[PDB]
Design a protein around this ligand. Sequence first.
Ligand SMILES: CC(=O)Nc1ccc(Oc2ncccn2)cc1
Ligand SMILES: [Zn+2]
Ligand SMILES: [Zn+2]
Ligand SMILES: [Zn+2]
Length: 459
Amino acid sequence: PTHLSVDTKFKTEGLCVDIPGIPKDMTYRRLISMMGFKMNYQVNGYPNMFITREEAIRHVRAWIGFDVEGCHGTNLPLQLGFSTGVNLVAVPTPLMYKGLPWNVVRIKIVQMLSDTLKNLSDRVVFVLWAHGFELTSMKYFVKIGPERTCCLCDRRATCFSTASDTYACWHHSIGFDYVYNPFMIDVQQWGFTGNLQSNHDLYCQVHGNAHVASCDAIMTRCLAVHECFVKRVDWTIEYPIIGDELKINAACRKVQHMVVKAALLADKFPVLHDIGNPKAIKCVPQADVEWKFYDAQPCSDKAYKIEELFYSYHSDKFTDGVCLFWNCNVDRYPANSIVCRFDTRVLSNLNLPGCDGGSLYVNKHAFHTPAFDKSAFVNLKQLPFFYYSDSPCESHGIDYVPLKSATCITRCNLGGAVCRHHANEYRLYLDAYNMMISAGFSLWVYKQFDTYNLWNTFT
Ligand SMILES: CC(=O)Nc1ccc(Oc2ncccn2)cc1
Ligand SMILES: [Zn+2]
Ligand SMILES: [Zn+2]
Ligand SMILES: [Zn+2]
């Protein structure tokens, strides 16, 4: 059972207001035919337009919410809404566009999907709360057939052009007019009571209902993200590399070792409380400190309440030494903390919009992250950039312009002239640091943290 069988039953009750008289007994096979598409008994990689919840989860980067509303069928204008916030009006003669015939609407659809998805996925997954008009509008902008490759590259085809009779991926589809072999999933098939707004509003206050198709499209995709990544979490699913994943993860480890190593040297805490991932390793293995670990998996719904993580009876005295929260999201960090908190508002190809202000950060695995909250950091301050090193000043082994920086905390800089080795390492560290920050990570530290305390470790 890799794919969804076309002979699987589809509950049609949600469809009967737009499609009155629709049979109760319905399969995907019959529904696809009713949508005006012909499958022709084809064993060519596209067995069904519809996919399973498990196939949808593996392809979350392709999710595009889609809703169609009657503007007043046949000669009835339709408002096509997408979770990108776009509303297009198709005539059969929060951005709102005036009514235009399908021949030009389809060009806009292909441009919009290609720009949204080219750096995210090899396909499109239309996320629906199906009532009828969305399924019946598909024939006007969608073509299907065997799985194909792009005319200009090796990627799978996502678009077709009637002008040239050719196929293209999201990167080479300029001027293309048809969406080719898209996928779709109907959230109503999952078993819900009541309408879309009543199910969406149970878990989210950020998306409102301005009574337009894009609002419904956004709510549908949000509800799907909540069901698949908030109330149900699967960290075994692997996602492909689409950007700077490897560099970001390597930078995260480098910055963690740097910041924790310097905090221990500058303030000499006798104990460190490491709160978070149950598979955590000591990030500063040579430190003298009593290292104590506390298990907490990544919170995907609301940030952990500090009172539940720490109280209800471990050193028990979390107030002793320092607390390390490396991507362990809490409502209010204690004053004696070293913190790395992912900022959900960051715009990137790894960060997808999520539920109730949260975001879906997809880097090797998918992590729904609760909304970034500035009040969580009131007992702390932003951690400034700095580079520290106690390693010998020795080159061993890329040209050189002399480094001058007040934040290069090394013996050579204390001595008045940064050596080549420490200048190379500083610049590499700065690149890693900027990579991590730009990926959305934010760093916070206890107010007494002062890098001036690091210079005296060079005696
Ligand atoms: C072993 C491991 O990978 N641990 C882990 C993963 C994700 C974590 O939350 C998170 N949230 C947003 C951005 C990044 N990370 C926390 C810890
Ligand atoms: Zn291509
Ligand atoms: Zn929402
Ligand atoms: Zn040096």
